[PDB]
Structure formats: C-alpha cells, structure tokens
Design a protein around this ligand. Structure first.
Ligand SMILES: CC1(C)CC(=O)c2c(nc3nn(-c4ccccc4)c(O)c3c2-c2cccs2)C1
Ligand SMILES: CC1(C)CC(=O)c2c(nc3nn(-c4ccccc4)c(O)c3c2-c2cccs2)C1
Ligand SMILES: [Mg+2]
Ligand SMILES: [Mg+2]
Lengths: 5, 335, 339, 337
C-alpha cells in the first residue's frame, strides 16, 4: 500500500 | 563466515546440498556471488535461478524443483532472511570503549561494556545500562536513563529526565525530549508553558533519523515496546503509542494523540490530536486523520496525481462541488 | 524552587483561600498531583472529582471555589495562571552552565556577562553573545553571528554565519538557522549554484522547535518577527518574512519569498507556496495547501479527510472522473430545459 | 574579494559599457545595491527605475542598454551571469580551515592535500578525504566512507559507514547520509530488525540541503546521480535511485526502491510511493500525491487547494459523499430517459 512497507 | 550446515541449523532450515559451503555474507539475487547467501519470496524469480550466482538460496518447498544451487527450505523466506542477516551482520558499532574526548559528568552511572564515542556529552545524573553504546557527538541530558543494550548513533540528542528501555536503536539527528509546543496567550502574546513531563520509551524501540519526540507538558509522552518510527517524524507532547505500532517516514502527530497496538501509519500522514486510534489500524500514505478511529482496518485519504491539464479541471470542479450539488438538487426538483 | 503558597498567590495575583504557609514544590497534573504540588482546574466538570486530587493547592475560578477540597487560588484565568506558575516552578535545567573547557571559541568572539557555553560547542570568529546567553553542548555558531541577551540554544543547534538573533529567544536541538536557500540558475540542464549571501534576522522572544530549518536569503534577508513561535520539523525557505506573534505548528513547509503577516496561526503540516502574501490574522488549518495569496483575515482550510479504504477508493475514482460527471450534469440540464 | 569592473566583465564574457576601472566589492539586489556593488536586471519593467539604483554597475541585455544609468555589463543571460558573478564575489565562508586540534581523526584515515576539518569533527577508521575536502565542525564521518575532492560538509553533518560521495558536493547542516531504513520481518506481530548492509553512492556536484535524510540500501545501494540538487528535510528511503540533474524541493518524502529518472523536477512536500519508476523529464508540482508509476515525461499535479473554512466544510462533505451524488445523477438520467 501507499507509503507502507 | 560460517559453514552452510551450521547456518541452516541456526535458521531451522532444511538444507539441500553441500553443507561444507562457507557463507560470508548476504546479497540480493541479482548481486550474489560465490560466498553469499540470498533469498527469494516472489515466484517470478524461479525461471532465472540459474543466472543467480549465490552459493545458497533461501526458498520455500514449492521453489525447490527450480533450484539451481544449494537451497535452504523454510516456511518464511523473508523472516529467515532477517535472521541470517543478523548472523552475518557487518554493521559497525556507533562507538567502542570510552573516547578520551567524550565529556562525561562525574555523577553519571555506567554499566559493564558501555561505549561512548568521540565528543559525546553525558550530563549529570545520567544512567547508562550494560552494553549501551553512545555514538560520537551525542548529547544525553540530565538524569536521563538508557537501558541495557540500547544504542544511539552519532549526533543524537536526548534531553533531560528521559527514560529509554533495553535494546533500543536511535539513528542520527533525532531529538528525544524537546519542549512540547505549549503556550498560553495573553492578549495575542504567546506565554511559554514549561514542559516538565518526560518521554518514556519502552524496550526494543527503533527510531529513525531527524525524528523529534517532544516531552509531555506535565505527564509523559509514551512510546510502547517494540514500536518502530522512521525518519522525519514529529511526535508531539503527551502522545501515547501502543506496543508494536510502526510509524513510517515524515508522519506528523499532534498533541495528546493516542495510537493503539499493532497499527501501521503510512508515510507523510497527518494525525490530529486529542483523539484515539484503536488497535490494528492501518493508515495509508498522506492520510489526513481528522477524527478518532474506533474500528480496526485500512483507512485512506487523498485525491491522487493526474496529468496537470486534467488536474486543473478536477480541482476547479471539486472546489465548485457545492454549486454542482445545488444544480443536481434543482434538477431533481424540476424532474 | 520551593515557595510558600501565600508568596505564590501574590506573584500570580491570585486570591488565596487556605493556609498560605503550605510549601509548594512543583506543578503537577490533577491526576498525578501529590502533597507539595499545585495543580489547576480548567474544566468545571472536575468539580465533583476534586476530592480525588491530592494536590496541596488548586488554581480555579470563583465559581469553582465552593467545590474545592484543598487550599484554592482563585483567578480569572486558570490556564494563564498555570503557565505563569509553571514558569515560577520550572524544573527545566539550563542547556549549559559556565564555559566548558572542551568548547572551542574563537579568540575574536565577544561574550557578555553570565554567558554559558556547553561542552564541545564551537563558536566562530566575530561572534557576539549578549548577557545571559546560553549555548548548549555541541552547538555551532558561525562567523559574525549575533545572539541577543537572554537567548538560549539547546544542544546540537546549528547557526550559520551573519545570522542575527534577538533577545530571549529559545531554540530547540537539531535545528539549523541560516543554511543556503535552494537557489540555482540553470545552464543547459546543469544547475549553477547561486551563492546565498543574504542572512536570517530573528526578532525577540522567538521560540523555535527541534529539527526546524530556516534558510538564509539569497541577497536580502529571511526575517522572523518578534514573539513568533515555530514548532518542530518546520521549513522556512530563503526570503520568507513572518510577522510578529505568528504561530507555526509542526511540520509546516514555507516556500521562498512567502510573506506571512502578524497574528497568523498556521496549522500543522500545512504547505505554503511562495512569492505571495498572507495578511494579518489568518488561520490556516492543519495540512492546508496554500496556493494563492490570502488578502482577508479569517479561517481557511483544505483537504479531503480519511475514509475506510474501500470507501476511499470509490471517492477517489469518482473525484478523478468528476469532469465526466460535470458533462453529464450539463447534458441533463439541457434536456430538462427542452434544448 | 574586490575586482575591477573590466576584469569582472572579462571573467563573465560580458560587454563592458562604462569605466573598466570601477572597483566592484560585492553583489547586491537592485534595491539594496550601494556604491561598489554590482547588481543585475532581469525584468525590463525596471528600465525606468534604473536611475533609482545606487549600484556601481548593472548586468543587463543589449535591449536594456539605452536605459542604463550606470556602467552596464551586456550579456545574453543576466540571470546566469548573476549566478556566475555571485560565485566570483561570494562572501560565504568555508566550513573550516586547516585541521582543528579538537578534531578526532582515526590514524587510518587517509587525507588528501589541503583538507580542512573543523573543531570537534570526528573521522572514523578507513575514511578517505580527497584533495581540498572541507569538513565542518561537529561532523561525523563513519568507517570506510569516501568523500571526493572539493566536496564540503557544513557543520553537524552525519555520514555513516561505507558511504561514497563524489567531487564538488555540498551538504548543509543536520543532514544524515546512510542511516538504517525500515527493514523488518514481522514475527507474530513482533518486529525483527534486518541489518541494512547496502550503501549510499552520491555522485559529483550534488547539493543536499539541511536536515535531509538519505538511508542506505538494504543489500544493494541507494544512488544519487551527478548534478542532483536536493532541498531541506527530504526523506530518501533505502534503495531509492535519483537520476542525474534531477531537482528535489523541500520536504519531499520518497518510499523505498523508488527510481527517479534524469532531469526530473519534484515539487516541495510531494509524497512518492516506492517500488516503482518515474521516467526522465517529469515534473511533479508541489504536494503531489504520487501513488503510481509515471511513464511519460510531462507535468503532473494533485491536491484540492485552500478555501474559506465555511466553504471547505461543504466541499469536503460533498466529496466524501460523492458516491451518493453519482448515484443520484445516474437515477435522474434514467428517470429523464
Ligand atoms: C500555538 C498553539 C499554542 C495554539 C495553536 O494554534 C496550535 C498549536 N498546536 C498545534 N498543533 N497542530 C498540529 C500539529 C501537528 C499535526 C496537526 C496539527 C496545530 O495545527 C496547532 C495549532 C494550530 C491549529 C490551527 C492553526 S495553528 C499550539
Ligand atoms: C530548483 C529550483 C532552482 C527551480 C525549481 O524547480 C524549484 C525550486 N524551488 C522550489 N521550491 N519549491 C517548494 C518548496 C517548498 C514548498 C513548496 C514548493 C518547489 O516546488 C520548487 C521548485 C520546483 C517546482 C516544481 C517542481 S521543483 C528551485
Ligand atoms: Mg511533511
Ligand atoms: Mg572536544
């Protein structure tokens, strides 16, 4: 997901 | 450097091939050479494993038919990678022994195997647990306590009356315990509210670089055990973060926010304060968190990128959406 | 630090009800307060809970007084009185005391009286520190910079050259004042550095948080007015001007040549574009995306808040396709108009 | 350093009109310029205002010349000329001079010629500093890192271990190069730290602003191309690759394994997703929410800008409820047809 690991 | 068989034993992995192979380090699949162990998680890499020049590849059972070298079969290749990387870790320590240029107050208390780097400054009353390492140029303020096995890289600032647990890691440029942003207002003039709370950091906390965590106003800012915080984060006074929560880079949190356990805060999110987020919440990147979150799950916000010509029309229509809504209502009425 | 309750009430201009010989040793929250502590009540909802607070004294209003279960200091404004009394009883240590032998101080620096400079601080040539200035451990203060009387730097603060800081400022650790602005010309794709030979001018009673960056101007100066408070993780580009008494919350980014007037309140993580002006008495709420000048006072906002991710996917897909929605609307209006 | 107008003119490839013996001592803005200063005009609307400028000389174009009220330097590009002449007349000090007695320098560090290292800086074992490198006060340079000739670090910069930095770079204070990025395996809700054993490779002529953080790679490297300029308080995650000559403005957050091509321009406060590619010649305007790969050159934007709060409340509520608006629209379309 967006800006997640 | 370790014999393959000895390594597979420490990793609880089923070895398939020569156990006498000497492994010296970890490498990506594209980069691995003789001596390297690597891993795969994506089945896309199966077809070209004969192009991989690692001595050993960590994989699953479903991968083994495609292996073209010694393999370590395991259920979780990614977790096995984390473990074998710790075993083969090359990272130096922030410091070794106590530097003669360090400046250490006489009333500081140090445990066994404390290392303090060059030109670090340790204030009166500080307590450093066993095996604690303080990088070069750090500052540790009055009466602060750092638990055993914790490590600060170079140029970390810890204020006074801060408490850090065991086996924490804090990267350079980070500031723990600065004043919270607290002011009364006297006819338009700001009046400082001294911030005499503290920061309490649990065990096994990792904090990134150029992150700031403010001390509380009266009671404390609290970071739970196992929390990980990335770079460029702001954690305001009296925030409370529950155990094992992960906060990605550039997240900005306002005062008196409470985050539960096992949350994931995506990069560049903005979380308002005096509110609570329950356990097991994921906020995706750039999330504008305005209201409490009371149910676990994934939450998101933001209108994503478009070609500039398209964006100009999108933003103008959105800005005039009330007119659109009125025209829709007028039309319903007429129809 | 310890003070008789009667002395404290006089310094606060409060009405004392109770034993003025009580010794107060510190401020505490209502939940945490114990013998020797003063606390305060701002929310009369807690009137019925005061018997549970074990503070030696509580700051409250006249309407609150009949509900007290302790010595009470009656005031018009408990919150402002709390600020004042926490200053009187402040336990915050100083960033340094006296002049550390490990400090490195150019022989041409000029110190006033009662200056303190902490361990391993570095002071460049031509620097002037006014009376009672305090430079924390590990700071750097560049050539010819001037820091006015009473101002204080926490540890590991970086001030560049030719910076001017007024009186009674407070700067938190990790902050950098006077770095190069982001200035480049461009010769066929090659960036050509524009030296940034302006300065930063900071007024009096300015408080700056931690890991904040304030760039110097390109020719003329970046200016921060008197009584300005700026939080952590802020970025102030070259040639920004901020008016007196403005407050900037955490993570705010301000592009070059922005002018902000007086008594503004900039909410956290706002993004303020440059070469434009915001007038006096403007509030930008958190995460505000400021693309245009603001010429009237008042409260301004932007941003679409959080939704459940499944809901958000639909919201974002429909918004991104809103031009088609607008075309459908106009077409239907034509039909209803019989054209 | 003071210079004769004719000599400055020669160094600038400028056509001198006026007294070549005028002594120029500094650069100044048009309004601040006094005797001894040189300044420049990029906007021909100031032509009628040149008599109000107290500079000893003005850089302008051939079309401006008839309007001069001072010695003029005629050039094709006054702005580029300004940049060049400000370099010649730069008053910016060096971050250090010579090697301070308080610096702590490991015996195994290799120092080139004419290296300056400021007070209380700390240089680890195996470090190599090329000719004319300057390390500001209070810096840290970790084991085996290499900094090429002419590169300069302002005060209180942190370089970790095994970092390669090229020639003629400039890094502003508070910046951190080579920290550990997020790298964790999840083991039953418990985080297991993965050592980050890749590096950062920064090319030549790179400028990095203040309090910017660049993480090292997990196995392979984070890579900054040549000629890149990066502003303050950017986060560059592990294994990001930024192509040559790209500009990144202040406060940009990039996630891991993002690849940015050459000659991009990333506007301030943008937020860029990882494991994906942005091609050459892309401009993202300020505050861009870049979730998806960008595969065509050009300009991209996002974001709904400020409104009066009373207006914003309706805008945000209507957008949040836009699915219901869309359904109503669909069902009015059926009812009409
Ligand atoms: C200066 C003051 C004493 C009062 C004040 O006005 C203010 C303060 N703290 C804030 N924190 N955040 C914040 C921080 C991080 C994320 C999101 C929000 C704001 O937006 C804040 C504001 C403002 C609200 C609206 C405009 S300024 C403390
Ligand atoms: C590199 C250059 C000489 C020219 C340039 O392109 C540029 C420059 N300064 C900027 N400041 N900000 C900014 C900073 C903070 C908040 C909001 C905006 C930008 O977005 C900037 C940009 C860009 C615009 C669009 C893409 S990059 C200086
Ligand atoms: Mg930000
Ligand atoms: Mg020293």
């Amino acid at each position: 997901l967006y800006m997640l690991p | 450097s370790i014999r393959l068989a000895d390594l597979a034993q420490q990793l609880d992995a089923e070895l398939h091939g020569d156990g006498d192979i000497v492994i010296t380090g970890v490498a990506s699949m594209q980069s691995a050479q003789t001596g390297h162990i690597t891993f795969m998680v994506n089945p896309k890499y199966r077809e070209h494993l004969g192009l991989c020049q690692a001595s050993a590849v960590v994989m699953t059972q479903d991968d083994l038919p495609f292996a073209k070298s010694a393999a370590l079969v395991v259920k979780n290749p990614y977790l096995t990678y984390a473990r074998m990387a710790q075993i083969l870790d090359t990272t130096p320590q922030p410091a070794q022994n106590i530097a003669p240029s360090a400046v250490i107050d006489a009333t500081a208390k140090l445990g066994n195997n404390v290392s303090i780097g060059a030109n670090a400054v340790i204030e009166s009353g500080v307590e450093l647990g066993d095996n604690v390492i303080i990088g070069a140029g750090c500052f540790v303020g009055k009466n602060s306590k750092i638990g055993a096995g914790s490590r600060l890289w170079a140029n970390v600032t810890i204020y006074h009356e801060i408490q850090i647990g065991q086996n924490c890691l804090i990267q350079s440029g980070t500031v723990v315990g600065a004043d919270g942003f607290g002011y009364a207002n006297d006819r338009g003039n700001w009046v400082k509210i001294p911030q005499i709370g503290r920061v309490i950091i649990g065990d096994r906390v990792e904090i990134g670089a150029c992150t700031t965590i403010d001390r509380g106003a009266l009671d404390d800012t609290i970071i739970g055990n196992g929390v990980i915080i990335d770079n460029q984060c702001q954690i305001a006074h009296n925030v409370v973060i529950g155990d094992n929560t992960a906060v990605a880079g550039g997240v900005i949190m306002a005062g008196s926010l409470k985050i539960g356990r096992y949350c994931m805060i995506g990069g560049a999110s903005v979380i308002n304060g005096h509110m609570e987020i329950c356990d097991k919440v994921t906020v995706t990147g750039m999330g504008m968190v305005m209201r409490p979150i009371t149910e676990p799950g994934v939450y998101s916000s933001g209108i994503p990128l478009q070609p500039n010509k398209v964006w100009r029309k999108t933003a103008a229509l959105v800005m005039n959406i009330d007119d659109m809504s009125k025209r829709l209502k007028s039309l319903e009425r007429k129809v």
